[PDB]
Amino acid sequence: CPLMVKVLDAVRGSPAINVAVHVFRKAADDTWEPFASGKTSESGELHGLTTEEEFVEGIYKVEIDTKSYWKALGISPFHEHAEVVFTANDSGPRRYTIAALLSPYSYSTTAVVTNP
Amino acid sequence: CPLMVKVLDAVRGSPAINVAVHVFRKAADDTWEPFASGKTSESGELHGLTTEEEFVEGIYKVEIDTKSYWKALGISPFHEHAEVVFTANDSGPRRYTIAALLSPYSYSTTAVVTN
Amino acid sequence: CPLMVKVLDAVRGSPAINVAVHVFRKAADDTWEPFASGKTSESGELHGLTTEEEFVEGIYKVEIDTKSYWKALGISPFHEHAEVVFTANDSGPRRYTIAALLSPYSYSTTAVVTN
Amino acid sequence: CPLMVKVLDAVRGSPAINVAVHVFRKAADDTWEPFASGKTSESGELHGLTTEEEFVEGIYKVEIDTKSYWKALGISPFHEHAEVVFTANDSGPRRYTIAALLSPYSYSTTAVVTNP
Ligand SMILES: Cc1cc([N+](=O)[O-])c(O)c([N+](=O)[O-])c1
Ligand SMILES: Cc1cc([N+](=O)[O-])c(O)c([N+](=O)[O-])c1
Ligand code: NA
Ligand code: NA
């Protein structure tokens, strides 16, 4: 799979498990079209969102549902979600890992981009 | 002002100057309505976006034009922009600082909410 | 003052108040000599650590007592402390801000070096 | 192995490869005794530093040689290194991943602690 999402919890020192993730792709009319969704596993990783064939060039938005995560654990966090928006595959196919480290009032995110 | 935005550059160890920032408020029909905007100053800060009277409870989005910032430095970045989405609550402390720390392939954001 | 330390709490979205900070300078024999210390204020900031005359070029260590901070909040943290080690250079901008953002199992640190 | 170190580069969007790492353990006389060392692989990971038998209770310091990393790439960074100091195994053996995300004037670090 050319798109993976990994989420860690900076309060517990653990993977962030069961985090809902929704991916969108910008359509020709400039709207966000639903593309794929899933939830992180016990390792904090979400695999299998898409395929090389379906992950064409485009502008993608990876929405990480951080508020639902913290609220499911009884914490009242600051952000509604974390959004990661990027152009993908504009120089040919690449593999993308979108990582995020969560705290109730802060998050970090980075990307690892590799050429298969 | 109840809302301030600060942007820092982790590559050069400096404020991120002249970064465009747009603030939106979520409307009843679930669309994003323009609310306020500006460019960060020489200190990386953007003051005066709004007033206590105008900054009512609701859901707000702060969009930071990180791509244009890096492109002006001759660096090709990963993200189209950085977006910070949050609910303003009256119960909470009154003043909101939204800080972002930028690298070409990474950003962090935190909220400092105080009296 | 050429050196300021700022500490923020990512769990509560607030300054980290009353955090002990110790600064050391590396001596010729490679040991760490005490240089300055204090506690962060209600704004999470520690000002007045040193002067331009005293802050000569060299290697400095800023140790932030993060463990005591979390323990006072009833939270068990991972790190013994956070340490920031850097060289002061005269060529560079004059004023150094060392910022740290704290969570129980994580911290970030950045330097803002300006004129 | 119960201790792993992973390092990423936030400028390049890639693993941080060939980063030197030195681990120390506080001795009874309060000095930092050398414990293990190595360098990150092409994946940004450093495996095999120690064993369950030799990784006893103690206070450990993981020194990540960030300045040498950036300088080997011709960048002049702010920090001399990144130091991660923690008590390990005080409630029995655990597995520790020490992660770090590097920029020239900033770094983040987190831990993932699991119970085998
Ligand atoms: C002021 C500041 C410092 C750091 N830092 O790295 O020390 C940060 O990460 C952030 N932030 O927004 O996440 C803000
Ligand atoms: C910083 C970081 C740490 C871990 N980690 O395992 O702690 C990761 O897996 C990743 N990543 O990209 O997948 C990044
Ligand atoms: Na192209
Ligand atoms: Na014990």
Tab-separated table of C-alpha atoms in Angstrom, chain B residues 6-112:
chain	number	residue	atom	x	y	z
B	6	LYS	CA	2.460	32.684	16.303
B	7	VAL	CA	4.568	30.874	13.690
B	8	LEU	CA	8.197	29.745	14.061
B	9	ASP	CA	10.751	28.316	11.578
B	10	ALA	CA	12.579	25.207	12.846
B	11	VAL	CA	15.108	25.227	9.990
B	12	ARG	CA	16.482	28.696	10.626
B	13	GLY	CA	15.596	29.063	14.315
B	14	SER	CA	13.636	32.234	13.719
B	15	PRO	CA	10.148	33.664	13.598
B	16	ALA	CA	8.334	32.847	10.370
B	17	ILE	CA	7.740	36.307	8.918
B	18	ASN	CA	5.105	37.421	6.396
B	19	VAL	CA	3.157	34.133	6.602
B	20	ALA	CA	-0.463	34.472	5.505
B	21	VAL	CA	-3.025	33.344	8.044
B	22	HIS	CA	-6.769	32.991	7.413
B	23	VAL	CA	-9.362	32.393	10.124
B	24	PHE	CA	-12.811	30.954	9.411
B	25	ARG	CA	-15.875	30.309	11.559
B	26	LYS	CA	-18.152	27.341	10.946
B	27	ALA	CA	-21.617	28.480	9.850
B	28	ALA	CA	-24.934	26.775	10.589
B	29	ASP	CA	-24.882	25.066	7.176
B	30	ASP	CA	-21.465	23.496	7.992
B	31	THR	CA	-19.495	25.692	5.588
B	32	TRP	CA	-16.459	27.776	6.537
B	33	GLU	CA	-17.156	31.524	6.573
B	34	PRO	CA	-14.209	33.954	6.396
B	35	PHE	CA	-13.687	35.601	9.791
B	36	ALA	CA	-10.299	37.375	9.891
B	37	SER	CA	-6.881	37.280	8.231
B	38	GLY	CA	-3.440	38.837	8.180
B	39	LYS	CA	0.278	38.205	7.802
B	40	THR	CA	2.709	37.405	10.608
B	41	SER	CA	4.930	40.284	11.701
B	42	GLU	CA	8.720	40.374	12.089
B	43	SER	CA	8.243	38.581	15.432
B	44	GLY	CA	6.288	35.780	13.769
B	45	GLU	CA	3.108	36.985	15.499
B	46	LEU	CA	-0.288	38.078	14.217
B	47	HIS	CA	-2.214	40.279	16.643
B	48	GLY	CA	-5.510	42.091	16.378
B	49	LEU	CA	-7.415	39.446	14.431
B	50	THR	CA	-10.640	39.922	16.414
B	51	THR	CA	-12.346	41.355	19.490
B	52	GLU	CA	-14.001	39.862	22.545
B	53	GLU	CA	-17.430	40.928	21.251
B	54	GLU	CA	-16.971	39.222	17.876
B	55	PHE	CA	-15.201	36.033	19.093
B	56	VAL	CA	-18.282	34.125	20.260
B	57	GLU	CA	-18.410	30.421	21.038
B	58	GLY	CA	-18.230	28.216	17.990
B	59	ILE	CA	-15.883	26.177	15.824
B	60	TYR	CA	-12.991	28.052	14.188
B	61	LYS	CA	-10.321	27.119	11.645
B	62	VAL	CA	-6.909	28.794	11.452
B	63	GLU	CA	-5.247	28.105	8.085
B	64	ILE	CA	-1.522	28.916	7.857
B	65	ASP	CA	-0.056	29.254	4.313
B	66	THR	CA	3.049	27.192	4.981
B	67	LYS	CA	3.603	26.209	1.313
B	68	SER	CA	4.084	29.835	0.153
B	69	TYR	CA	6.471	30.448	3.059
B	70	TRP	CA	8.814	27.593	2.098
B	71	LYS	CA	8.555	28.333	-1.638
B	72	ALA	CA	9.702	31.904	-1.007
B	73	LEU	CA	12.820	30.475	0.662
B	74	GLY	CA	13.532	28.244	-2.331
B	75	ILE	CA	12.521	25.075	-0.463
B	76	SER	CA	10.001	22.508	-1.716
B	77	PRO	CA	7.656	21.544	1.160
B	78	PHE	CA	5.280	18.654	1.822
B	79	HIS	CA	2.044	20.275	3.036
B	80	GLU	CA	-0.330	22.524	1.151
B	81	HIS	CA	-0.968	24.426	4.410
B	82	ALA	CA	-1.372	23.800	8.142
B	83	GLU	CA	-4.927	23.906	9.543
B	84	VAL	CA	-5.861	24.192	13.230
B	85	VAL	CA	-9.533	23.498	14.046
B	86	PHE	CA	-10.913	24.047	17.549
B	87	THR	CA	-13.958	25.089	19.570
B	88	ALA	CA	-13.934	28.387	21.460
B	89	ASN	CA	-15.448	27.929	24.911
B	90	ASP	CA	-16.513	30.741	27.255
B	91	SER	CA	-16.031	28.588	30.364
B	92	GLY	CA	-12.357	28.281	29.554
B	93	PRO	CA	-9.608	30.839	29.996
B	94	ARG	CA	-10.121	33.888	27.816
B	95	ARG	CA	-7.096	34.229	25.652
B	96	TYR	CA	-6.049	31.763	22.947
B	97	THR	CA	-2.559	31.540	21.464
B	98	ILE	CA	-2.260	29.176	18.502
B	99	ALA	CA	1.433	28.439	17.905
B	100	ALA	CA	2.873	26.509	14.990
B	101	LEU	CA	6.451	25.312	14.488
B	102	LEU	CA	7.298	24.631	10.847
B	103	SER	CA	9.732	22.341	9.013
B	104	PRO	CA	9.584	21.427	5.296
B	105	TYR	CA	8.035	17.986	5.958
B	106	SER	CA	6.596	18.505	9.440
B	107	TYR	CA	4.702	20.891	11.651
B	108	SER	CA	3.609	21.003	15.232
B	109	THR	CA	0.871	23.074	16.748
B	110	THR	CA	-0.121	23.812	20.321
B	111	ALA	CA	-2.719	25.964	22.045
B	112	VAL	CA	-1.917	28.123	25.065
